[PDB]
Scaffold this active site. Structure first.
Site, PDB file in Angstrom:
ATOM      1  N   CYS A   1       0.752  -1.662   0.370  1.00 26.94           N
ATOM      2  CA  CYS A   1       0.148  -0.009   0.047  1.00 26.94           C
ATOM      3  C   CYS A   1       0.220   1.645  -0.361  1.00 26.94           C
ATOM      4  CB  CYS A   1      -0.882   0.040   1.535  1.00 26.94           C
ATOM      5  SG  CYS A   1      -0.178  -0.817   2.156  1.00 26.94           S
TER       6      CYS A   1
ATOM      7  N   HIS B   1       1.463   5.207   8.751  1.00 26.06           N
ATOM      8  CA  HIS B   1       0.421   3.898   8.590  1.00 26.06           C
ATOM      9  C   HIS B   1      -0.877   4.105   9.879  1.00 26.06           C
ATOM     10  CE1 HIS B   1      -0.715   0.766   6.246  1.00 26.06           C
ATOM     11  NE2 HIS B   1      -0.193   1.672   5.024  1.00 26.06           N
TER      12      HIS B   1
HETATM   13  N1  LIG Z   1      -4.326  -3.840   4.881  1.00 27.22           N
HETATM   14  C1  LIG Z   1      -3.585  -2.959   4.415  1.00 27.22           C
HETATM   15  O1  LIG Z   1      -3.808  -1.896   4.344  1.00 27.22           O
HETATM   16  C2  LIG Z   1      -2.767  -3.933   2.626  1.00 27.22           C
HETATM   17  C3  LIG Z   1      -2.215  -2.709   2.388  1.00 27.22           C
HETATM   18  C4  LIG Z   1      -1.158  -3.247   1.475  1.00 27.22           C
HETATM   19  C5  LIG Z   1      -0.715  -4.381   1.401  1.00 27.22           C
HETATM   20  N2  LIG Z   1      -1.376  -5.317   3.210  1.00 27.22           N
HETATM   21  C6  LIG Z   1      -0.968  -7.089   2.745  1.00 27.22           C
HETATM   22  O2  LIG Z   1      -2.164  -8.126   2.193  1.00 27.22           O
HETATM   23  C7  LIG Z   1      -2.386  -9.303   2.911  1.00 27.22           C
HETATM   24  C8  LIG Z   1      -3.706  -9.244   3.443  1.00 27.22           C
HETATM   25  O3  LIG Z   1      -3.934  -7.617   4.062  1.00 27.22           O
HETATM   26  P1  LIG Z   1      -5.058  -8.046   5.275  1.00 27.22           P
HETATM   27  O4  LIG Z   1      -5.379  -7.319   6.054  1.00 27.22           O
HETATM   28  O5  LIG Z   1      -6.503  -8.252   4.468  1.00 27.22           O
HETATM   29  O6  LIG Z   1      -5.053  -9.424   6.480  1.00 27.22           O
HETATM   30  P2  LIG Z   1      -6.042  -9.844   7.549  1.00 27.22           P
HETATM   31  O7  LIG Z   1      -5.350 -10.531   8.402  1.00 27.22           O
HETATM   32  O8  LIG Z   1      -7.167  -9.215   7.908  1.00 27.22           O
HETATM   33  O9  LIG Z   1      -6.807 -11.081   6.177  1.00 27.22           O
HETATM   34  C9  LIG Z   1      -6.622 -12.476   6.175  1.00 27.22           C
HETATM   35  C10 LIG Z   1      -7.202 -13.361   5.414  1.00 27.22           C
HETATM   36  O10 LIG Z   1      -6.442 -14.839   4.783  1.00 27.22           O
HETATM   37  C11 LIG Z   1      -7.983 -15.141   6.255  1.00 27.22           C
HETATM   38  N3  LIG Z   1      -6.650 -16.650   6.172  1.00 27.22           N
HETATM   39  C12 LIG Z   1      -5.734 -17.225   7.140  1.00 27.22           C
HETATM   40  N4  LIG Z   1      -4.915 -18.072   6.911  1.00 27.22           N
HETATM   41  C13 LIG Z   1      -5.596 -18.380   5.857  1.00 27.22           C
HETATM   42  C14 LIG Z   1      -5.531 -20.115   4.469  1.00 27.22           C
HETATM   43  N5  LIG Z   1      -4.563 -21.036   4.879  1.00 27.22           N
HETATM   44  N6  LIG Z   1      -6.030 -19.694   3.577  1.00 27.22           N
HETATM   45  C15 LIG Z   1      -7.040 -18.620   3.243  1.00 27.22           C
HETATM   46  N7  LIG Z   1      -7.663 -17.832   3.947  1.00 27.22           N
HETATM   47  C16 LIG Z   1      -6.857 -17.971   5.404  1.00 27.22           C
HETATM   48  C17 LIG Z   1      -7.521 -14.648   7.132  1.00 27.22           C
HETATM   49  O11 LIG Z   1      -8.701 -15.744   8.170  1.00 27.22           O
HETATM   50  C18 LIG Z   1      -8.200 -13.548   6.969  1.00 27.22           C
HETATM   51  O12 LIG Z   1      -9.370 -13.031   6.267  1.00 27.22           O
HETATM   52  C19 LIG Z   1      -0.605  -8.970   4.053  1.00 27.22           C
HETATM   53  O13 LIG Z   1      -0.034  -9.725   3.371  1.00 27.22           O
HETATM   54  C20 LIG Z   1      -1.350  -7.724   4.226  1.00 27.22           C
HETATM   55  O14 LIG Z   1       0.174  -7.358   4.648  1.00 27.22           O
HETATM   56  C21 LIG Z   1      -2.385  -5.224   3.102  1.00 27.22           C
END
Ligand SMILES: NC(=O)c1ccc[n+]([C@@H]2O[C@H](COP(=O)([O-])OP(=O)(O)OC[C@H]3O[C@@H](n4cnc5c(N)ncnc54)[C@H](O)[C@@H]3O)[C@@H](O)[C@H]2O)c1
Ligand SMILES: NC(=O)c1ccc[n+]([C@@H]2O[C@H](COP(=O)([O-])OP(=O)(O)OC[C@H]3O[C@@H](n4cnc5c(N)ncnc54)[C@H](O)[C@@H]3O)[C@@H](O)[C@H]2O)c1
Ligand SMILES: NC(=O)c1ccc[n+]([C@@H]2O[C@H](COP(=O)([O-])OP(=O)(O)OC[C@H]3O[C@@H](n4cnc5c(N)ncnc54)[C@H](O)[C@@H]3O)[C@@H](O)[C@H]2O)c1
Ligand SMILES: NC(=O)c1ccc[n+]([C@@H]2O[C@H](COP(=O)([O-])OP(=O)(O)OC[C@H]3O[C@@H](n4cnc5c(N)ncnc54)[C@H](O)[C@@H]3O)[C@@H](O)[C@H]2O)c1
Lengths: 338, 339, 339, 338
Positions: free
Chosen positions: B158, B185
């Protein structure tokens, strides 16, 4: 015992009183507060002094009378009805030596002189002043204070953190130019909800978002370090946090210095010439570890980054407790001259 | 010609990607359709978390459930969520999924992320900085470097989608010698609510009670999308008590001495021209509340610009959740335009 | 002569229990000593989480480390943390632990909690409501009902340790016919920072971005410590964006008609008499920030007391982290005295 | 089109304008705002209206001139210079029919009559009033308004939620007595840091703790339901949340009813006599699902509990958006009499 009187018993006024009590318990303080002035009665001032949302409860018991507040058997004349200018407060009758001006409305030395005219011997403005006798940051330009200064300014809390970092970098490596960004806690001058304000950025809800506001800590660095006048500039970013702030100074150095060189120079300065003002951290700390910390600048060695000639230095500072402890140390230095 | 998309990890980014896809369909600038979503929970919890959101509110469409599929409105998404094993165990080929959006956070390595392709997926888009990936793409910067010969695709962080347009304009107009970054952030799910164990002792602390300084590779890996700025940038991050919405503060030494008005006019020309839709220009005293649910990847604040000789400080906002997911939707449409 | 204690779960309650023990030792009203701590992390993270606290600040004592032991000030506590399995795997008997303070939250059932006793512990104190436990004790209410023949001892909820002194004074002085309560609680670690999957869809939302109404067995299980009130009380919880500090709002129908001044006078006499140390009487306009780091179980707010005929609403504050942990210290000292 | 003039373009005022704009887009609104008074220039009012920390950005473009602020095709004279009483505002010159009093300082009808003296036909106070002509809660006693009322009030944000809940409980099972506790969002009248305040509870930091304050929502239920006068009482607890609140009413019923019986009566009322005022929810919703919801009372059937005849009913309500939509609907009902 230096007799001190507070004008504006708000956040800084009560933080100065609590830091004075803690420094008396540590033995590094001799001044005592005998009067406090604010636009409210003694019952409200005593309740705000006993119960603090940030500093917790006061260990001493707090009582009231009719015009004075009683703490640890000690009494402080709550001369608060003086809603006019600072010249209306009876400092001469109370025998107040040093007056800590902390209302935020009397930052001008022309107005701040009302304390001196009312009987006070010296005035310490808890903010950047105008037409002041001297702007002092304890540990930077405190030696430039002789007995011929009355309108003294302790500058801003951000200035008290940026000055040690810029002093070490300039004295050891030399500063060509720098741009800083202090990530600051929200203050009373902001609005809780979206309302009118002279600053449309701080007009927004303080606790709901981050409001970028201006600051004169870097632009007025020449007031304490004349060699860096006009070489620094920056702004502020108020975050939803009660107390605790951090400065992010990105500076070009005259001589190329490594990350290890900058961290070693800050560690030797913190434990030597700046012992008690600057503190060196090699531990992964956060702002919760900075709340209630008397140091002016808490250098975070882990967030240091250097490319070729450009270096980013990160240093924490508590905008309330740390700055008020410097107001206590400055009141003791001025009291030594009286 | 509708591109069939399958989401792996229906978390914050996963649901924001589905919401940005639905909003872009209502605007008419989207053609891909999501058909499957996988998590570590039943379909009822996924349907509830999609309907009710703390940041974006309630979904305008009705949301229902069955036993294995979640029904939004006139739309059916196979809730193939029981697949808690590796990414290869998911039936992407059986469900006919073209592009797979990896958003779990545990499958960032392309070695493991290749299981989607083995499972029957045509292209994989990782919603995070990857390892050994085919290409790292930031829309509006190096999006042209994507041909048909990439399957393990990544879309960077992001913070990267905000830093890259700012550094691209500064380098193309004034030249960048070196720069250092501090991105303020919003807190993310990988942080603890109270003081608890964590691999990062900084993020171990209470996320809403203080500011946690953490590391980031957005500036250190800027050469993946701007090779002329490789090794010229570096920085870190500072998480603050905000749910969504972040800001980047880049202090950079310029090759040519520029004025404040020169930098603002250069960013304004880019926002109204080659970066229309990716970079947005603001001459108003805005705050991060105005950045929540903003689809732009980099929101340049012209009022916070400062310069001293050649050293300039540029401040740009971005919604780390909504703006990044809209870029993921645009990237999925770009990948679909190839195959 | 010092009762040896071992903490299972060095989390928020675990560290708050250790800090409350150290503060009570500096005051002289404590003799038990913690010699072992078990958590799902190494001793470095345990020492860092103990030294730096986001709510309680920094520890006045210096904290060091070794290879398997964390050194406070002069004292050493064996960080037997590798035991990631059940509580029966921890070597309490080998470490010489007499009383074990169970605070992981995953071993609330006595079928698991008995693993401490099989491992060499003489008595177990669960910092939460238990299942099939030997006795549930609320200090100042049913503390006399503890003889030497109990090992699966459970301290009730933090909400129960505040609601029980209210219900005890109201029933013993005026009689309680029926009551409905609503505790306004601070968010805890079991909640999610953002919208994610959770067994409780209410606690699945962002804890700091909204107020999550969750259920509690604090009022429904009051009969475990006051049998005359079994089934007569019930209520729920409402988590608010607050780190530590909670308040109970009990609306109760009284058997005998009582006035507001009579209820405040009875609570003031109880706080200054039979409940000195457990119940606190406040006549000052206090808020929850005045309740943080307060060791009392229930802080009765006399200003918020209201009554209509025989329906009265009683409001009492309590610090769910510090005040509850001091009651775990006093309970561990009482059980240690029974050895 | 009913001509409306706003006195107090703050949170409630701008929420009223945005709710009026959204209701005009829905087609069920005819009033038009022509003036706004707010003790600040038109530039700050235009910026605070375009950018909201809770309601986000305004979909329409917002511009300014010299004394008026432009929406999109609509120009609103920012008559904000009137810093004196409401009788000094030029409502007659601008042709304003109904005036929405939203400053909070003119709740008393003695001062609120200045709008009527200034040329306004009707006055709607956005708060509980004193010596008012009638206190109306839409959906409860809105029929008791004839053409013989000029100074009208819409009670509080909490009252607009407790009144539907108390009406359903009394009409179906009867209310002997009840005690309530509204868990409310913090409002502008609270302090950001620990500072002086008329209320020592609300003097504390609003975003750092919960401030228990008093409310007349239940005590003044007789103004809209005379049979419940003196039978209800309660207080408030301000929590760190920007908008959105919830009421928790524990009430003794005349007839012992079950949880299923009360939930069924609330579901039929939300689908019948209170369609548009009361909302029924069977989903595990939180306050973030209640923000920007126009309903006056969002009954949460999952949090209902009963023992004998004492029942606890929980209902959500948005103190900002929901109350302002009730003000828009009231302005349309009052304008229908002109
Ligand atoms: N949050 C942000 O603003 C943002 C921005 C850029 C990048 N990212 C990256 O994107 C990714 C996801 O972010 P997020 O905020 O959605 O994360 P989150 O932890 O809020 O959600 C992740 C999801 O993955 C699911 N999950 C866990 N284990 C799993 C498995 N084995 N198989 C399938 N699904 C599974 C969880 O239950 C959850 O629903 C991370 O790498 C994060 O760093 C996040
Ligand atoms: N962290 C900080 O808040 C911080 C740090 C450094 C410097 N300062 C500066 O110190 C000053 C005080 O800051 P603060 O946050 O404590 O402010 P505050 O608003 O919390 O308190 C200021 C006080 O001034 C009082 N006051 C107003 N009008 C008055 C009058 N006519 N006479 C007497 N008292 C009057 C107010 O009632 C209040 O008690 C300001 O100049 C501020 O910029 C603040
Ligand atoms: N938080 C409160 O205010 C409060 C109040 C009263 C009771 N409690 C009870 O305390 C317990 C949780 O304490 P908390 O919420 O304050 O903090 P927490 O959730 O951090 O406590 C649990 C700790 O146990 C550790 N742990 C040790 N061995 C473990 C294992 N084998 N598996 C998993 N974790 C292991 C975890 O890593 C974690 O640090 C629950 O029983 C809860 O009901 C909490
Ligand atoms: N905040 C809520 O959720 C809520 C809900 C229901 C009712 N109310 C009531 O509505 C009223 C307004 O509430 P609010 O939150 O919008 O208040 P606010 O203080 O946030 O806004 C009030 C506005 O009035 C303006 N104003 C105009 N003339 C003024 C004058 N002469 N002096 C001072 N200010 C002047 C102010 O500048 C400000 O913009 C109060 O009576 C409040 O109790 C508030």
């Amino acid at each position: 015992t230096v007799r001190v009187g507070i004008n504006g018993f708000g956040r800084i006024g009560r933080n100065f009183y609590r830091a004075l009590l803690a420094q008396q318990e540590q033995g590094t303080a001799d001044v005592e507060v005998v009067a406090a002035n604010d636009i409210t009665d003694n019952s409200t001032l005593a309740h705000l002094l006993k119960f603090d949302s940030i500093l917790g409860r006061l260990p001493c018991d707090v009582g009231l009378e009719g015009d004075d507040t009683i703490v640890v058997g000690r009494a402080k004349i709550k001369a608060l009805a003086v809603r006019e200018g600072p010249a209306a407060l009876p400092w001469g009758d109370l025998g107040v030596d040093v007056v800590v001006e902390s209302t935020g409305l009397f930052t001008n030395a022309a107005k701040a002189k009302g304390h001196l005219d009312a009987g006070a011997k010296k005035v310490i403005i808890s903010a950047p002043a105008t037409d002041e006798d001297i702007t002092i940051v304890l540990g930077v330009n405190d030696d430039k204070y002789d007995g011929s200064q009355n309108i003294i300014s302790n500058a801003s809390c951000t200035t008290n953190c940026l000055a040690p970092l810029a002093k070490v970098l300039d004295d050891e490596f030399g500063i060509v130019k720098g741009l800083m960004t202090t990530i600051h806690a929200y203050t009373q001058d902001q609005n809780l909800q979206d309302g009118p304000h002279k600053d449309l950025r701080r007009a927004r809800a303080a606790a709901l978002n981050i409001v970028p506001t201006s600051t004169g800590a870097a632009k007025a660095i020449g007031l304490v370090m004349p060699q860096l006048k006009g070489k620094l500039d920056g702004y502020a970013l108020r975050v939803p946090i009660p107390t605790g702030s951090v400065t992010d100074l990105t500076v070009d150095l005259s001589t190329r210095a490594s990350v290890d060189e900058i961290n070693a120079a800050f560690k030797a300065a913190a434990e030597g010439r700046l012992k008690g003002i600057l503190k060196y951290y090699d531990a992964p700390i956060v702002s919760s570890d900075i709340v209630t910390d008397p140091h002016s600048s808490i250098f975070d060695s882990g967030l240091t980054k250097v490319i070729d000639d450009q270096a980013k230095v990160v240093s924490w500072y508590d905008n309330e407790w740390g700055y008020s402890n410097r107001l206590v140390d400055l009141v003791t230095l001025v009291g030594k001259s009286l």
